[PDB]
Amino acid sequence: LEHFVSILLKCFDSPWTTRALSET
Amino acid sequence: IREESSYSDIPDVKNDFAFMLHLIDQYDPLYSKRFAVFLSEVSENKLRQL
Amino acid sequence: PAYRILKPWWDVFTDYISIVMLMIAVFGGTLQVTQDKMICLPCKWVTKDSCNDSTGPTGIKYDLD
Amino acid sequence: PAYRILKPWWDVFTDYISIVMLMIAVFGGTLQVTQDKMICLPCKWVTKDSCNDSTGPTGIKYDLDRHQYNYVDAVCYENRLHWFAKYFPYLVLLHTLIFLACSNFWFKFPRTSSKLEHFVSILLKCFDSPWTTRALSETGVLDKKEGEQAKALFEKVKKFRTHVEEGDIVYRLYMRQTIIKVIKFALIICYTVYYVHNIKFDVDCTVDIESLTGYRTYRCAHPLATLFKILASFYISLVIFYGLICMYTLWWMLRRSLKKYSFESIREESSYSDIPDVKNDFAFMLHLIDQYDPLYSKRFAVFLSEVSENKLRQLNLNNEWTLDKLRQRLTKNAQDKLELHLFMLSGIPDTVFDLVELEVLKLELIPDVTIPPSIAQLTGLKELWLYHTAAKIEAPALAFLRENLRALHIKFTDIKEIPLWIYSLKTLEELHLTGNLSAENNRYIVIDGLRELKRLKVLRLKSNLSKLPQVVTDVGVHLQKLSINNEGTKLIVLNSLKKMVNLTELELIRCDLERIPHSIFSLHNLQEIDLKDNNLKTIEEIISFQHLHRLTCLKLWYNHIAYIPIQIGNLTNLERLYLNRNKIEKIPTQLFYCRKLRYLDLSHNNLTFLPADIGLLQNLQNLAVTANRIEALPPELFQCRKLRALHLGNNVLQSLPSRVGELTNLTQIELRGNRLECLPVELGECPLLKRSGLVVEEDLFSTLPPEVKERLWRADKE
Amino acid sequence: EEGDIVYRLYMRQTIIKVIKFALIICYTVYYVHNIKFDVDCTVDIESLTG
């Protein structure tokens, strides 16, 4: 669980995501 | 999400990693959406190109 | 801290209900401990292991310590 | 963490009042627990189930044991004493708990908690941004990092707005919460006030146990009644105060109608009008933050405006393009002029204007442009091209351009893309307009102001014009070249063209004229004429061109001309004659009185042979007769000693004469597209020819001597 | 520059403290002497004790 949530928060906090979502 | 955002090449999830996603969905779907991007191989290909 | 995300709403309600239950538990417990009384008296006339229930009035004397 | 900002003042009062209520609740509870006494005695003489109330005095003797008093105490306490006096503090405690639950529910409920924490996180990281205080301060040069921070922040705000706009869950729950608090208030006031008077110090109780004691009635006393009475009064007072606060909150919320945030005050004050109003579930938050502190609303509002975003785009654009990168992107064009071509950007980078060598600027499909003063740095600017780009400008840059510009090109859809200031210019030498110059019932209003452009030497118009404008012929005092490409729309000339005495070159292109007008003969300075696409079949009128002594170039391609009139021999000053792509059947010999001709193009006509009189062009240098069916060349062709190029490819030549050896200055020759088997060796006799210049099929080329090919190899690299 | 709220509240606060001070001094000193060790009380219950 702690490993999972660590992955999840660092994915949400990642900078590439907002670009990847903005491209649509 | 794969129909909406047009990242079709993500398989369905198997046991013990789906359940976690259901829970996070019950809390907030947004984290599921933000997490779903990395599963796609198109993401890896595009980042390689970039 | 971070495990807030895991808990769904129903787990939260269960938690607070458990707190309330524990509260009343502790209260009843200490209340029992601090006074633990029962008050008994005898019954002079008996009918089938029960009370017959049969110049001003006067108090009754049982002659007990 | 920092949810203090969310809570309004009334919420604060509710919180602390709840703490006080809980305090008195706990106190009354522990007091009840730690002593729980009532003191009973019997009553000897009874009258109507009550006491008759009828040598020193003496004490009364009841003959009871100490424990029996406790028994009767418990009995009269259980039965006849009233329940409210027993269970007051417990009830109060319960009520306080359920108040607090209603208070903190919408924080602890996750579906809304996520939206709230996400919202406040965005708000605090927006408030802490530096560009916000700059943008508000405005009412230079910036870091690459913070620019990207701001851009990412904008898009975050946008997706967040899109995400919150639909929900409308928080408002509903807060509504339900307030309503619950109010109805519960009313209920507790009701029964509390109804039952409070029942508390009493003294109580008479008749319990009906004779066997155990032998007494009927009892009189009893309850010491704590007074204290609970005052606590209850104090309690209901606090509760009243609480409920009045809640009622005020309710009235405010239902009156104000918060689903739409009006927002008008800041946009009127700070003059940022292009912000829409807000819809449900994102307006409510702003109302709350307004109740806390109006400043955060203003600090947050800036990102909603698109003007702020456009300005930020301009700033990143000025930040990004470095000078060294632009220098390598520049181009030196065909006229040895340094040019830059840009298209489809958000504006003009300010770094452009430090490229001091620039001479031509081109702007294509860029919206809302304003020319900055730094354009005064481009001391060598000569041309500006504005393709579908309206441009504002202020006086300093305007004056610089008035004094330092030679040409202006405009491509436009309609008047809105025409800068009004162009007619206040004074040094312009060329104007080029692409688009319809007219509007309904307003013909040529767009160009009425041309009269102020007193130095224009060339005007070209491609505007689908029905007539020649009066203003053109009015400006014809100094104009030297006028060119109209009408794309087959019929042009009306009507006697105005005769004023243009200074005209030296005229092109009336694709005007469906069908006959050369006679006004042209008064234009005694004409040097060149082009009559593209006028369906010309006979050109006899050229006889009166004999008075145009500098006429050197006549361009009559793609017409239906059947023959060349004989009077061409009187045009002795001709240097260029193009009659290609026509229906010409023969060549008059009189053409060869034009002994100063250099260029003659008769390709794509119906010529079978070349007359011997071609030997008379003593000044001929280049010649194309391409794509006719000429079988062989006359010998007299080689009397033209000055030939340098002969384009004869894609004909049906069967042999190439040896006398090609005599063409000393030949560097380019077409023989391709023939059914030749070999080539004549005498092609090697041409000194200035190179392998790249001998334009022929490779298999035919191979037939030449190896020595020639070696000399061609030497010739190339030398 | 426009507000002038803090001064008003601090003013009202001080005034409330002072008037409340005066009131408590008043009734406290007026009633303090009434506390005593010994008391005589006539309650009028003959029936219960005589």
Curated annotation (Swiss-Prot), chain A:
Q: Please give the knockout or disruption phenotype noted for this protein.
A: Increased prenatal and postnatal mortality, growth retardation, and multiple tissue abnormalities. B-cell development is slightly impaired, without affecting B-cell function. Mice however show a cell-autonomous early block in thymocyte development and impairs peripheral T-cell expansion and function. Conditional deletion in germ cells leads to abnormal sperm and male infertility: the cytoplasm of late spermatids appears swollen, preventing reduction of the cytoplasm during further development into spermatozoa.
| Distribution of this protein across tissues and organs | Ubiquitously expressed. High levels detected in the bone marrow; lower levels found in peripheral blood cells. Highly expressed in pancreatic beta cells.
**What post-translational events are described?**
N-glycosylated.
- Localization of this protein: Cell membrane; Lysosome membrane
Annotated disease: Defects in Lrrc8a are the cause of ebouriffe (ebo), a spontaneous mutation that causes male sterility. Spermatozoa present in the epididymis display severe malformations, mostly of the tail. A drastic decrease of the spermatid population is observed, whereas spermatogonia and spermatocytes seem moderately affected. Defects are caused by decreased volume-regulated anion channel (VRAC) activity in germ cells. Oogenesis is not affected but embryos derived from ebo/ebo females show early developmental failure.
Q: What does its UniProt record remark on the domains? A: The volume-regulated anion channel (VRAC) channel forms a trimer of dimers, with symmetry mismatch between the pore-forming domain and the cytosolic LRR repeats, a topology similar to gap junction proteins. The di-leucine motif is required for lysosomal localization.
Function, please? Essential component of the volume-regulated anion channel (VRAC, also named VSOAC channel), an anion channel required to maintain a constant cell volume in response to extracellular or intracellular osmotic changes. The VRAC channel conducts iodide better than chloride and can also conduct organic osmolytes like taurine. Mediates efflux of amino acids, such as aspartate and glutamate, in response to osmotic stress.
Q: How does it assemble?
A: Heterohexamer; oligomerizes with other LRRC8 proteins (LRRC8B, LRRC8C, LRRC8D and/or LRRC8E) to form a heterohexamer. Can form homohexamers in vitro, but these have lower conductance than heterohexamers. In vivo, the subunit composition may depend primarily on expression levels, and heterooligomeric channels containing various proportions of the different LRRC8 proteins may coexist. Interact with GRB2. Interacts with NOX4; this interaction prevents the ubiquitin-mediated degradation of LRRC8A.
> Family, per the entry?
Belongs to the LRRC8 family.
The name of this protein is Volume-regulated anion channel subunit LRRC8A
Q: Which organism is it from?
A: Mus musculus
Swiss-Prot record, chain B:
What domain of life is recorded for the organism? Eukaryota
Summarize what gene deletion causes.
Answer: Increased prenatal and postnatal mortality, growth retardation, and multiple tissue abnormalities. B-cell development is slightly impaired, without affecting B-cell function. Mice however show a cell-autonomous early block in thymocyte development and impairs peripheral T-cell expansion and function. Conditional deletion in germ cells leads to abnormal sperm and male infertility: the cytoplasm of late spermatids appears swollen, preventing reduction of the cytoplasm during further development into spermatozoa.
Instruction: Cite the record's tissue specificity text.
Output: Ubiquitously expressed. High levels detected in the bone marrow; lower levels found in peripheral blood cells. Highly expressed in pancreatic beta cells.
Q: Where in the cell is it found?
A: Cell membrane; Lysosome membrane
The PTM entry states:
N-glycosylated.
Q: Its function?
A: Essential component of the volume-regulated anion channel (VRAC, also named VSOAC channel), an anion channel required to maintain a constant cell volume in response to extracellular or intracellular osmotic changes. The VRAC channel conducts iodide better than chloride and can also conduct organic osmolytes like taurine. Mediates efflux of amino acids, such as aspartate and glutamate, in response to osmotic stress.
Associated disease: Defects in Lrrc8a are the cause of ebouriffe (ebo), a spontaneous mutation that causes male sterility. Spermatozoa present in the epididymis display severe malformations, mostly of the tail. A drastic decrease of the spermatid population is observed, whereas spermatogonia and spermatocytes seem moderately affected. Defects are caused by decreased volume-regulated anion channel (VRAC) activity in germ cells. Oogenesis is not affected but embryos derived from ebo/ebo females show early developmental failure.
Subunit structure comment from the entry: Heterohexamer; oligomerizes with other LRRC8 proteins (LRRC8B, LRRC8C, LRRC8D and/or LRRC8E) to form a heterohexamer. Can form homohexamers in vitro, but these have lower conductance than heterohexamers. In vivo, the subunit composition may depend primarily on expression levels, and heterooligomeric channels containing various proportions of the different LRRC8 proteins may coexist. Interact with GRB2. Interacts with NOX4; this interaction prevents the ubiquitin-mediated degradation of LRRC8A.
Record's comment describing the protein's domains: The volume-regulated anion channel (VRAC) channel forms a trimer of dimers, with symmetry mismatch between the pore-forming domain and the cytosolic LRR repeats, a topology similar to gap junction proteins. The di-leucine motif is required for lysosomal localization.
Which family is it part of?
Answer: Belongs to the LRRC8 family.
- What is the protein name stated in its UniProt record? Volume-regulated anion channel subunit LRRC8A
